[PDB]
């Protein structure tokens with residue numbers, strides 16, 4: 001994140017691992 | 033009769049297409065070269081005529097179908113296809129309306145601007161000739177040709193990408209005589225190929241900024257999975273050079289997934305984790321790669337692979353064989369200090385190379401990389417860092433067993449600069465010896481150090497009066513590599529003189545080594561330790577002022593690792609006293 | 610050769626690597642070497658040749674080079690030359706092998722392939738150092754090398770038992786030019802307390818038209834006149 005379509009797929013990968021809907025992870029990571 | 037010639041052209045195109053789609057490795061190329069002979073014979077039959085206008089678009093269809101099937105099988109263009117283009121172009125000129133292809137094209141495109149309905153075949157011809165110029169690295173005049181095709185008022189557009197995009201195919205290729213490939217299909221190939229080539233050049237030349245543009249363009253459109261792979265790898269390289277590691281890793285993962293041949297990526301992974309210093313991961317990736325390179329189709333069509341250059345050493349797509357790498361693992365394992373691991377790895381290198389009469393040729397490390405005997409030396413310097421010294425002597429026995437003949441018979445020894453001794457023989461005694469110090473036997477050590485110092489000094493390695501064979505360019509002729517073998521041998525021997533308690537002899541060899549190589553500093557440390565024992569004050573200070581007056585180029589590996597090995601930790605500590 | 614009028618046409622069944630522009634080719638143990646025509650650069654290619662009794666296949670091309678110094682009636686020529694210990698070819702003795710090819714070929718006990726070309730350049734390539742790939746393109750400058758320039762074309766390379774006092778540990782190397790600058794080589798180990806190469810360009814007759822080698826240093830050759838001989842013993 002600190003470095004587009006790639007980054008969306010990366011959040012999809014994290015979401016598929018953790019079993020969280022991608023929006024929450026995206027928001028949390030963006031806010032941090 | 034054009035009915036019958038077109039029946040033949042159509043027939044042989046269907047035969048070539050049958051061959052591309054179906055078949056096995058021989059029957060494919062058998063039918064393909066049968067079709068090539070057919071298109072050759074038909075071309076000669078049509079060139080026998082004083083061309084008609086209605087015979088012209090069949091002849092050019094046959095010329096295009098001949099050059100396609102020629103370059104797809106040769107897997108490479110040449111100048112006979114350029115002469116064939118010249119023949120077809122001069123044949124277009126002598127029907128209605130000479131010098132060379134560029135001005136011939138200029139005049140032919142003016143003749144096509146008279147609108148004879150064969151522009152479908154002219155644009156296809158431009159595609160093939162452009163492919164010839166692209167594979168031949170003829171990028172200046174290509175811009176001029178396509179510039180003449182489109183508006184000449186687009187003259188300032190030197191960049192081929194935009195120019196190739198504007199270059200339109202003229203038709204959807206209406207019911208004319210059959211072709212193997214259409215001009216738009218060749219346009220897609222042109223774009224990705226040229227984009228790729230420009231990107232690679234921009235990468236190597238240190239604009240991995242401008243690279244990304246061309247390379248993303250290479251991805252978007254026709255990009256076969258095999259190119260997709262290598263592009264992404266390029267992207268890994270670029271981001272890695274910029275500083276941005278995680279984007280690089282992204283592309284590399286994609287490279288892995290998409291690829292059936294993921295040697296090139298992990299080398300990039302190695303260089304990445306090496307740039308950061310993640311040594312563990314570096315070695316782990318390389319470890320995988322080597323097992324990777326353990327593991328291992330041609331269309332009658334112009335594919336992109338054709339037009340790409342087989343890569344250079346500067347490229348991030350240069351990926352050696354198992355052997356060339358496993359050497360990398362061992363080198364990289366040795367410069368960290370995992371001597372144990374290193375040992376094993378070097379042994380595995382050496383097992384491959386030498387046992388190999390029966391299998392596939394696994395090869396030596398390549399000659400911008402190190403000579404076959406510098407590599408038995410790196411094997412032994414690992415086997416010393418390990419403390420496997422009775423292995424480090426089966427090494428130095430193995431070597432000089434094979435290479436008896438090559439050695440000097442050393443009768444200058446009796447007859448007491450001129451006779452010739454290649455560094456690696458003078459080394460081989462230097463590490464044959466260190467083996468005996470680890471087995472603890474002063475005599476036969478001071479033997480081998482003294483015999484190493486005789487084959488440095490009553491012989492010269494720089495005797496290329498006769499380039500007599502294949503020979504060590506780089507590693508084994510550097511004056512730096514010679515003065516750094518000498519200092520070392522005198523150190524290795526001067527410390528045996530301290531161990532037998534003859535510290536005058538020791539002093540003399542240490543004093544000699546500072547005279548030999550004043551930029552090693554290990555020499556000055558050993559000399560100053562001897563002087564600080566016995567007679568410090570004036571002598572020691574005289575060398576202090578010299579060190580402060582004083583204040584790596586290309587020494588080979590086995591030797592730097594040996595120097596690194598003996599050098600003491602407590603060295604600068606001593607030099608600030 | 611078993612192969613179940615006494616004329617037999619070949620079937621294209623039997624064709625392998627219809628490379629088609631390949632002129633010349635040798636054989637070592639279960640390796641196959643070709644030397645193939647192109648534009649200005651001719652190239653050495655080098656294939657696997659399957660050791661098991663199978664469908665007689667090429668396999669994958671290991672290696673390619675381009676004989677960069679060569680820029681073209683007369684073929685060129687290829688010789689198989691093994692070092693001692695390790696075959697339709699010529700085993701040299703260690704002295705020599707070490708002298709001509711270097712420590713690489715020595716150590717690896719690598720068999721070596723000697724190309725005589727129409728220019729009369731006379732080149733050898735080490736087979737161990739000839740494995741390449743599409744990532745890994747064989748650099749000719751460094752990989753292939755150039756012994757001795759007969760100024761005329763080459764006809765016949767060989768190797769002889771001088772001093773005989775089937776696997777002969779041969780001692781000598783023989784070239785032939787077309788017009789007959791014959792070129793033979795041996796080890797001296799003389800006069801610098803060093804191994805040095807022994808070079809002779811003789812000038813036989815004539816046009817030399819072909820040449821074999823027999824028991825004990827005797828080179829059975831031809832001129833258009835007659836079938837003549839040289840002894841180097």
Ligand SMILES: [Zn+2]
Pocket residue numbers: 402403405406456504507508
């Ligand atoms: Zn070397």
